[PDB]
């Protein structure tokens, strides 16, 4: 309303424009997310219901803070804390130089801390991708865009119309599992971890079947031994080609043994034995972690 | 199902 001055359009998301704004009374710089109430005439959108109610309870250094919600008759505003840019934009900028490994370790460490808080508080993010991770100039990285978030005090069903983009989609989702688990968020972080290191996306698929085959060509086509139950999963087919698992020294060569170990556990096929965000924080890979400071806006 | 609660 009247207390906010719009600075510039910063993005587009969930049927609504996002503006960088400044509080005219306090000088606070915020992110304004606008929801036009009258285009589906079904009241407040369900994605907004979940985003507000869940993010309210998530106060953590590595989660973008929901500052205020302004609910008028014909509009619905969400006020977030402002961060300069996304990790995807940062990756692109560092394409020639690369993100230094200590900064990679720091980001992954913080991401896991925010995610562990998320999971410990009964919320699945379900849309973890570089575009939805925000960073500042001080070395922090935070989870953002909870438009697909779900509370899993009771099981969350899989919906084909609400899923993370292909490149960061878990194998169980592609194979048509019925319910979500926390492992789907860890898998995404695994792909993001690898992408930060190689400067290339780990599994860049054109389609659902191409996404699966790209994962199979790297991690090997899973059997009942590796992952009990695959052959019975809905979208599994016996005509799946049988690929061999590749050694991780060829997949992520700049990694040492500790990094290779963690990434392997983050991309475990069977969701039950995929590492948790909490257990990942305890991995020997983070024993010497620091908080490096990035260089932004190249 | 479809009804008006008459209390």
């Amino acid at each position: 309303m009247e207390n906010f001055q719009k600075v510039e359009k910063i993005g587009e998301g969930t049927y609504g424009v996002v503006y960088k704004a400044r509080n005219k009374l306090t000088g606070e710089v915020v992110a304004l997310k606008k929801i036009r109430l009258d285009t589906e005439t079904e009241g407040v959108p369900s994605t907004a219901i979940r985003e507000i109610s869940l993010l309210k309870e998530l106060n953590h250094p590595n989660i973008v803070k929901l500052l205020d919600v302004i609910h008028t008759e014909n509009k619905l505003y969400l006020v977030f804390e402002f961060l300069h840019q996304d990790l995807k934009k940062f990756m692109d900028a560092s394409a020639l130089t690369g993100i230094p490994l200590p900064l990679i370790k720091s980001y992954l460490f913080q991401l896991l801390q925010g995610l562990a808080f998320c999971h410990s508080h009964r919320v699945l993010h379900r849309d973890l991708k570089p575009q939805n991770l925000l960073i500042n100039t001080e070395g922090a990285i935070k989870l953002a865009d909870f438009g697909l978030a779900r509370a899993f005090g009771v099981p969350v069903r899989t919906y084909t119309h609400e899923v993370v983009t292909l490149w960061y989609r878990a194998p169980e989702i592609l194979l048509g599992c019925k319910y979500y688990s926390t492992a789907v968020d860890i898998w995404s972080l695994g792909c993001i971890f690898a992408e930060m290191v190689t400067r290339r996306a780990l599994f860049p698929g054109d389609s659902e079947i191409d996404q699966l085959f790209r994962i199979f060509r790297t991690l090997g086509t899973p059997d009942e031994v590796v992952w009990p139950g695959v052959t019975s999963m809905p979208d599994y087919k016996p005509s799946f080609p049988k690929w061999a698992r590749q050694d991780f020294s060829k997949v992520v060569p700049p990694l040492d043994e500790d990094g290779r170990s963690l990434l392997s556990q983050m991309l475990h096929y069977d969701p039950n034995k995929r590492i948790s965000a909490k257990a990942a924080l305890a991995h020997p890979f983070f024993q010497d972690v620091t908080k490096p400071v990035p260089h932004l806006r190249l | 199902a479809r009804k008006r609660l008459e209390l």
Binding site: T41, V44, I52, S120, A151, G153 | A1, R2
Partner: protein
Amino acid sequence: PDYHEDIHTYLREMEVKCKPKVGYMKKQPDITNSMRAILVDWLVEVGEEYKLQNETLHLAVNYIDRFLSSMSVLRGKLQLVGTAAMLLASKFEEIYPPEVAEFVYITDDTYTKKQVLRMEHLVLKVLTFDLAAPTVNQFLTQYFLHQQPANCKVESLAMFLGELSLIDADPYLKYLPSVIAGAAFHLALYTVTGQSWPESLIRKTGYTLESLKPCLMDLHQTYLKAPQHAQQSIREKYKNSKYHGVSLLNPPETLNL
């Protein structure tokens, strides 16, 4: 592993914050507990009509009780409050909710679409967007993992006893969701398999069997007199083979406590 403990701990912490004023109905000039019973029972059938999750039903009741804790409501608007709570709960839990028109239609067009949408606005403001409330359903889920020899009949009977407690506010508004879930689990485990509230849950929840005794006595009475209750939607619901017809089970004469 541990994030299950952190979840149970967090739900236990949040269930205290989302609890309504226990005696709010005495301060309600125009509505009674019986009318509330008629409301929630109606909601049991709309969830059955539109094939909605049991969690959606539980959430709506929670919303209703909290709204009625702060706002005085006349008889003619009670159904409108329950409808908006059902729509909001549907928006939170379902993959996609029924359209608003369905909710207008299900009330026999008693209210208009604009009345429903603005009641949604009001409920959201009164509840201050705090919709992720812990339920008996959620705690039952957490408890069921400690039943390694999983029994579908026990789980179904526990859900049944859990849903029945939503109907009557007179005894159950003074019990926390986790406590109601505890009594419902023990009673179902005792009826179906003749064994008792296990140590693993005593360690987990801190609840002894005797700590659950007052709620357990109330719930066993609700179980016994369920055939004679004025509201029968839930009983009809749990006669179907989906719930192994657990509602038709003869409750034990005593509990020996």
